[PDB]
Design a protein around this nucleic acid. Structure first.
Ligand SMILES: [Mg+2]
Ligand SMILES: [Mg+2]
Ligand SMILES: [Mg+2]
Ligand SMILES: [Mg+2]
Ligand SMILES: [Mg+2]
Ligand SMILES: [Mg+2]
Ligand SMILES: [Mg+2]
Ligand SMILES: [Mg+2]
Ligand SMILES: [Mg+2]
Ligand SMILES: [Mg+2]
Ligand SMILES: [Mg+2]
Ligand SMILES: [Mg+2]
Ligand SMILES: [Mg+2]
Ligand SMILES: [Mg+2]
Length: 60
RNA sequence: UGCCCGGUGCCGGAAGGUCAAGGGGAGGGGUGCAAGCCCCGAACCGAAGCCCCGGUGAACGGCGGCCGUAACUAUAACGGU
């Protein structure tokens, strides 16, 4: 199991720069989910919990 | 060749506590007609030792536990007790 634990550690990573899946930029009001990728302009509405816009569209 | 002198040992301490023989003799008793003779006996004075106050490890000896915490884990330099 600890070998499987390190498999998680070694396959996640790394809360670092070149490592985004979505980019919430509050200085020009956008949240690009650079995976798919939607471009909703309601930044302070996504921070309130409107992730359906992303979840359902990113289950593909 | 580190840290611990609380326990034991040794060393130092004319204070204080306790301390035997002895000294002392408030008081009490036996007996005698009696002077007397004989026996207990409090306060108080009275050594070392012990207590007490310190020192001492190349003196006898002794030198912990639990809990949490860091770039996603592990570990814990750090903290709490
Ligand atoms: Mg110390
Ligand atoms: Mg000692
Ligand atoms: Mg000693
Ligand atoms: Mg001592
Ligand atoms: Mg002595
Ligand atoms: Mg006497
Ligand atoms: Mg006498
Ligand atoms: Mg008489
Ligand atoms: Mg006497
Ligand atoms: Mg003495
Ligand atoms: Mg002793
Ligand atoms: Mg030594
Ligand atoms: Mg000891
Ligand atoms: Mg940690």
């Amino acid at each position: 199991k600890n070998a499987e634990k390190q498999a998680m550690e070694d396959n996640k990573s790394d809360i670092g720069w070149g490592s985004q899946i979505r980019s919430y930029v509050l200085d020009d009001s956008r949240i690009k989910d650079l995976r798919t990728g939607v471009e909703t302009r309601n930044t302070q509405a996504v921070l309130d919990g409107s992730l359906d816009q992303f979840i359902e569209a990113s289950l593909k």
